[PDB]
From a paper:
Upon pro-peptide cleavage by cathepsin C, β-tryptase monomers form active tetramers in mast cell granules, where they are further stabilized by binding to serglycin proteoglycan carrying heparin glycosaminoglycan. Since β-tryptase monomers are essentially inactive at physiological conditions, tetrameric β-tryptases are the predominant enzymatically active protease in mast cell granules. The β-tryptase tetramer contains four active sites, located inside the core of the tetramer and facing the donut hole.
To gain further insights into the molecular details of this complex, we solved the crystal structure of the wild-type (WT) tetrameric βI-tryptase bound to E104.v1 Fab at 3.0 Å resolution. The crystallographic asymmetric unit contains one βI-tryptase tetramer interacting with four copies of E104.v1 Fab in accord with the EM structure. Overall, the antibody-antigen interface is characterized by contributions primarily from the heavy chain (~71% of buried surface area) and is on the small side for antibody-antigen complexes (682 Å2 vs. ~1100 Å2 on average). On the antibody side, key interactions are made with CDRL1 (Y29, N30, R32), CDRL3 (R94), CDRH1 (Y32), CDRH2 (S52-A54, T56, F58) and CDRH3 (P96-Y99, R100e). This epitope lies close to the small interface (protomers A:B or C:D). The E104 epitope largely overlaps with that of the 31A.v11 Fab epitope, except that the epitope for E104.v1 is shifted away from V60c-A63 and more towards Q81-R87. We conclude that E104.v1 Fab does not affect tetramer stability. Our data supports a model where the IgG works akin to a pair of molecular pliers where both Fab arms, which are connected via a strained hinge, simultaneously bind to two protomers diagonally across the tetramer and pry them apart, resulting in tetramer dissociation.
Author numbering:
A (entry chain E), B (entry chain H): 2 to 82, 82A, 82B, 82C, 83 to 100, 100A, 100B, 100C, ...
C (entry chain C), D (entry chain B), E (entry chain A), F (entry chain D): 16 to 37, 37A, 37B, 38 to 60, 60A, 60B, 60C, 60D, ...
G (entry chain F): 1 to 27, 27A, 28 to 95, 95A, 95B, 96 to 213
H (entry chain L): 2 to 27, 27A, 28 to 95, 95A, 95B, 96 to 213
The structure:
Amino acid sequence: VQLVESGPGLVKPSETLSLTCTVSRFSLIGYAITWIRQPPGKGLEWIGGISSAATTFYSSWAKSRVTISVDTSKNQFSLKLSSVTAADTAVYYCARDPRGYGAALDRLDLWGQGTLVTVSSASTKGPSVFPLAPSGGTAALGCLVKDYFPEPVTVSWNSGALTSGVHTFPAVLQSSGLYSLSSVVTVPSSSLGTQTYICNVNHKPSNTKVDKKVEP
Amino acid sequence: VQLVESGPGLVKPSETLSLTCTVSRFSLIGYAITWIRQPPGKGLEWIGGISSAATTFYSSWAKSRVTISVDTSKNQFSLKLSSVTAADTAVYYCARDPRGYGAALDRLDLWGQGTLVTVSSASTKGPSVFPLAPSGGTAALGCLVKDYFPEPVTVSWNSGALTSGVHTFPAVLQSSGLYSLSSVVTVPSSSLGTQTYICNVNHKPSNTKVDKKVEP
Amino acid sequence: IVGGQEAPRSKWPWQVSLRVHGPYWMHFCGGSLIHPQWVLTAAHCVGPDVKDLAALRVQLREQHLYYQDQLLPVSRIIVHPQFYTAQIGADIALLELEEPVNVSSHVHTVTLPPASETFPPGMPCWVTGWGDVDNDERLPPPFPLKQVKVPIMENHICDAKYHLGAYTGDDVRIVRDDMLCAGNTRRDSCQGDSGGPLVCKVNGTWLQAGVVSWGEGCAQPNRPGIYTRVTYYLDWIHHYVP
Amino acid sequence: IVGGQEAPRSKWPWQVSLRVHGPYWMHFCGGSLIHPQWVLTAAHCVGPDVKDLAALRVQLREQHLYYQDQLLPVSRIIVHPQFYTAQIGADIALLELEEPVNVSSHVHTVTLPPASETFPPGMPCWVTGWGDVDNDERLPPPFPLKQVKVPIMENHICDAKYHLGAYTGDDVRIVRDDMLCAGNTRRDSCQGDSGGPLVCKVNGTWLQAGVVSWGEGCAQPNRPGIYTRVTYYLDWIHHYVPKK
Amino acid sequence: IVGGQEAPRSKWPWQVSLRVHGPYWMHFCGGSLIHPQWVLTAAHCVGPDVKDLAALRVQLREQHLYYQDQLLPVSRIIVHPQFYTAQIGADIALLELEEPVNVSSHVHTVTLPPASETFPPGMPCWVTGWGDVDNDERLPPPFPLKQVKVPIMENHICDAKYHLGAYTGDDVRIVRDDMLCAGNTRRDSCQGDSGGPLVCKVNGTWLQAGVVSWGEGCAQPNRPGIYTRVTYYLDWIHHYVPK
Amino acid sequence: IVGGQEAPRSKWPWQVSLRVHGPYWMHFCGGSLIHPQWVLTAAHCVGPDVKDLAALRVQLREQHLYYQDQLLPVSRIIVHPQFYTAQIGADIALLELEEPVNVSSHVHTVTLPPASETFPPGMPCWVTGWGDVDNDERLPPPFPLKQVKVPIMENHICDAKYHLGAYTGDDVRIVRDDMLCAGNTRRDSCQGDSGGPLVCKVNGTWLQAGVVSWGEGCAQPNRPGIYTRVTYYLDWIHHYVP
Amino acid sequence: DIQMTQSPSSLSASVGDRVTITCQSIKSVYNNRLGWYQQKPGKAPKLLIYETSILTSGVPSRFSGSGSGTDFTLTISSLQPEDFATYYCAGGFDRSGDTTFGQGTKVEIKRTVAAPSVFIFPPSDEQLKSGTASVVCLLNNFYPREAKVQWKVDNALQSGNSQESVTEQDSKDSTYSLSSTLTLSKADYEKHKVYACEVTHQGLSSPVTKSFNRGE
Amino acid sequence: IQMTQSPSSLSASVGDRVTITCQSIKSVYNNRLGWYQQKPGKAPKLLIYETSILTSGVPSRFSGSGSGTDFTLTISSLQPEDFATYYCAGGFDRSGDTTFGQGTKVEIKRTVAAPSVFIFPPSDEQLKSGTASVVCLLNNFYPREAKVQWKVDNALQSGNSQESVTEQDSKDSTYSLSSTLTLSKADYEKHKVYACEVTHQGLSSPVTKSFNRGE
Ligand SMILES: *C[C@@](*)(O)[C@H](CCCNC(N)=[NH2+])NC(=O)CNC(=O)[C@@H](N)CCC(=O)O
Ligand SMILES: *C[C@@](*)(O)[C@H](CCCNC(N)=[NH2+])NC(=O)CNC(=O)[C@@H](N)CCC(=O)O
Ligand SMILES: *C[C@@](*)(O)[C@H](CCCNC(N)=[NH2+])NC(=O)CNC(=O)[C@@H](N)CCC(=O)O
Ligand SMILES: *C[C@@](*)(O)[C@H](CCCNC(N)=[NH2+])NC(=O)CNC(=O)[C@@H](N)CCC(=O)O
Ligand SMILES: [Ca+2]
Ligand SMILES: [Ca+2]
Ligand SMILES: [Ca+2]
């Protein structure tokens, strides 16, 4: 059983963020879907939810600016948040109460994967990928994924084939208001020049895919 | 599903090793049990087996001095090895062929835990436990389990509570004809004098259980 | 429902259908809306064992099962403390709904009787449900709600009938004072009808006389259907239900 | 029988198998030979409804069902008058055989206890039968008689366990004084074992402590097996069965 | 076996029972010992899908199932390559036993016929097995081996009967040349009898004429049982089984 | 239908449900309206044995079985003469209705293809029915008509797949020339879907490519669903159907 | 939106230690409506305990829930390295919207001191076409998190340009990897010649310096 | 009729493809060839049976291939836990012609890590009895190949030493070694400076850990 959040990753302030939760290989007839958000680095916050009997319940805050609905025909649940600020920048989750409650939180058994929504006046920018070239027994090499917006960026090596020793660091926000990230990997100082090392960088917000072959 | 080997751990030479393979919470009516042995440090060797139709098959060697049987009313399989020498000192395993073959080896799905059988004229001796006292950031401490017979000896720390950093070394046979063994553990130097460090030594052959508190 | 016909859309607005999770939210018992936040059912439907509420939903009055379903969550199960088995007695339970129902023309509550009400033979009584049409015979699709007019039988008359073709001593009571008898070999309630209502017209008003409880078989000779006598448990019901 | 092993040929000579007509005389309950002309069983096996005796036969102690059968006719069924259902109580019955059995080494009677016998925890008791091996799990062919050592539990302790995870009020008694408790989640009697004996060794003799009656499921947590306390009904049994 | 009685302890020493793992090694098909290392059965019992041999055992001639079992392992399953379904044909298989059977008075092989043998009506034939006693009716405990004398019917006669109350064109053959017909509404083989033998007395010797294969229902009007004509596959059997 | 979703009210107007008498006129096979007086179905649904027409009715396109039924009588059953079993082939039949259906927006006929049509892989094909949702798994109430987009596989490719993990010789053909392959382990037709249509969009029009015939299990590894190739039997169909 | 208090907000414990996280409210919980969630970084929360004490199937027995009314407790009898996560309690006070989540409790593993593997990466010749330069210092696999990285350029101490980012504690070895990135303009990167990062850590006896020469 | 495994031992990095071949002169009876994985102090585990069939629960990185006389076990992406001795086992007939292969020891190749060298003087309890036992510990290092020298009053020792290695760690892939110097109480009192000089690849210069018999 799966729950999937869908919606725009970047929203300008004062606008309205619109998200949908979709429920694959199951139409949950007697169940309830609630929406939860999580500011980056902060904790879980309840937005609201819809019951088994299609009844909406909204948290103390929100209420005024939030709307939750169901399209049984589409197997979809909607979330609409008007007049957004940088305070609404969070990871949006939809979860199921197997008792079909609507205003519960204590038994959210199934959860969505989460969807990052960034509220910013800033425009989307694709990253510039730079090689961190290897220079005894150990051999460290990586990729510098500089100046992109917004988050996220996905870094794989050799198209998924290299997973061990890989360390994709969390993105740090620069003075520029742009993100910069590094993905490193430790390999033997025998495999270099014999093995091809490519970091695959993917920025979905800007439809950018860069493949960068690192060499000594 | 479990297979359990039972029998004497120490056998004097010229005598007969008698082992039983008991089969808990499962009826193995259409199945076959084969016996395998493994000399210490050496590889797997086939002794013989009994088929689904109670037919015995014995390996090239052994044939003469080995007897395998079934007690259907007890769910037991026997192995009897006459005129034992130090060449028979091994770990004895009983395994199941789910095709009920009797002379197979290529599909031994269930296995017993293994039973060590030591063939010696020597008498059982309990170990003497000595502390390996700690001496500047991360300290090492242990227990010297000296002069015991036969194998094995089980060493735990703080009655199972301390598992990380624990290294119980393989036993070494001494000139005396006894075994010596060390169990070490790495801990932060800061934790010494604040944390209690006890090694729990157990020699089942002699019904010895020693608990030693290691101190600086 | 053994015997009887399909109920008109209008009739029995208090009728509920209890559901259980699985390949679908399948019907397993009936009950009655006695308050916008309460359902009255049989304890054997939901007990004596504690049930996971995740596995239960209530479906309000609709003509056929599963076609126009809108499943309501339950927040509490209150089984009578004296209940262990149907034949022992106290086969009565209350379900508190997580949300109050918006009452209408098609969906509204049933009136409970005064304690003084006896429900004697001759009384025009009806039992309703989506349960078995005969012994080990399920209600076929499209699953219409069924109704049957059942004759009320006095407890001693009914208990005497229950002893016919039984080893049980005549002095040993089978039909207990918290129970009520209704039915014959042609008209009766059956498995899956449990919890559902036995209503009788008393001075132009429908009062729930009983709750579908037990019986030996379905519409069997000398074995009328046994219902829990609602009058017996009024005080308990009203401790929870306004 | 849930848990436990296949009984040796020698053991439990009093064990009977109740049969019902059909494509074959199928096993449905057990019982015990308490007299050469009488068999002690549970009432729910044969009641509360009146049964046609043409549809019933008794099979004396044999290792496996149906392989070496000699079906004995029953002449009378005597169900305790206080019996309606197992949970209510008085789940005890007597079958009078049309012919007296010639007792032997493999087929003989079980001793009933004195009234003074309480059967407290610790006692070494055993339950025997050809019933279900687990919940909704039949005993597979060749149908061997099974035995299991079950632990005796006091009535109030057992009653308290029966209330755990139940809505039933604590003041509302489930395990009644004419009942006895035995079993755990690994060792227990099951459907088809009914009427069979619960025997305990008391000063070197096997006494039938109980008659397999009921229970919630088979070997379920906080649900021990409930048996009819034979002491409770001794006077009734002996109204029909010769004292000796 | 539909109709017929319980076989005497002596009779049918070649009769085997095929077992499948589960809460017990349950009977699911029959077969015949045709060689001390080979059992002849129906392909539909063990195919067309490839089966794990861990899930199969052979039980030699005994009076009742499960009472005195000694389960024998199988080392190889050889299904006729032309086999897909029973109605299509080639419903024949061989099981090679891991150990040879030491033949006795109660357990010995059945004689296969010469290719020239036709098995015409009138022939005293018997079919044996532990399968269904009637349609959707299992053999009750104590599971005795059953036997029934069945009348042999000619293929074209049988094929004509199969077309009665069927939409299938008369020119469209149902009973194929690798098949044989036997039975009536009172005497027949049924589900669980498959792979089992149809033996006929030919000049004082029992020869296996057929292998229990298929049929519409069990002992149904105008539906005699269909068996695999053993003569048809003699060359194939003897490619594996020593003469 | 294994995999796939509930069909919209609009889609598949040619879809029929074959009914068998009993406690209710239960669904057992599907079929397609190919003419206002004719139904195209699988022969195994109605044969090889001669069936009493008293035991059969046809139900035209509706969203859920049994809720809005209007059962139509059948006057004739025409099973292909070459039919004995599904695996042998010729698993095709025609039902002549006693009365012609009044065609509309929700209920109308499906177009049969020209003989020249091959239906190669890549083709957008859909199979529809009220049959099993998985192996030995019935469609639960309220019984919605289900649809699944299935991938077309070439006969030799399919035939090769059918031999994987089978004792049948490679030279022995399983998938016959009067047959067509479609499905995978996630998308497939199942028991109760037989007679139903496999329709493909060919130059903006829906043509019935196949008739649900057989397969080893439902959506099993290396076992695609097998259908009767409609092109193969066009001449036979049109001997009866205008 | 605060109605429930978790204590502590963060804790550090060794492997095998008993861990107790308390959740408290001023209003009493509605119908034992109190659940516990485990959130591993960059993943949706997992329901461990529901309805105060009921354990989600598959969840290890080391997790238990206890309490009633206003005071509740999550217990981890023998803390495992994988148990590193943020733990959230969530409760219901009514059925119409009075439900919240607790603050969260970051559970951190305490392990033996581990020294980092220090690496240096010069800025790519491709990145020096654009106006910026990025020197990357890597600190691979260490405990504790608390380390000091110093960027010395021509021996001058640098302040107001470097940015570091830590990986989340590994699920296996419980270590941390850190990346310190020095950012200067192209003008400033050619202005100097020797670049190095002086790493001070607990696991190092004396600070480790890794450098390079601009040109070689 | 025995079976030859090749190589007898191999060392590979994490993520590497590992190929162990099993070969015989007589052909295998009926695809009767299985692969076993034996982790130290544990019963062998059946991974592959009937040449290519994978035991349920066993990771997809394990595959079996081959026929007749030549077979191969493949580990597509070697994991640290995959350290074990792998044995093939085959059948040539049904009446006793079955053997196991000599086995192949698979070892993980990780970056060179230096040991943590520690020294332990005899305990006063052991000292009260006739013997003295000095212990040198080398903690968590790679490769296994290390040299420990015992020096007594700066004098090379021979004969009175016995070392024991731990089996490679399932998680971090390192080894630990213990060297024990056994001396008579009479000889232990005869000397003052006890040292264990450790020579490893991961050490720039040999590490010497000592104690003066006195504190
Ligand atoms: C719980 C509910 O579905 C049923 C229905 C009551 C039956 N009504 C009439 N008139 N017989 N209640 C029970 O099943 C309670 N148990 C019993 O009634 C048993 N005495 C009979 C069980 C049976 O035959 O299935
Ligand atoms: C009548 C007899 O064969 C059975 C067996 C007693 C079950 N024993 C234990 N230890 N659980 N007696 C009954 O079935 C009497 N009825 C009940 O026990 C019912 N409470 C439930 C029956 C069920 O779970 O199917
Ligand atoms: C495989 C074996 O158990 C049976 C026995 C053959 C039936 N014998 C006679 N005389 N009818 N073989 C089959 O069941 C093969 N398949 C069929 O017979 C099918 N045509 C229908 C099976 C059925 O009606 O159950
Ligand atoms: C008659 C019709 O409802 C079914 C459905 C066809 C199965 N479809 C797919 N895609 N797998 N047709 C049959 O059952 C025809 N016979 C067979 O399919 C047999 N090979 C197996 C029958 C079974 O498993 O029940
Ligand atoms: Ca049960
Ligand atoms: Ca049939
Ligand atoms: Ca099927």
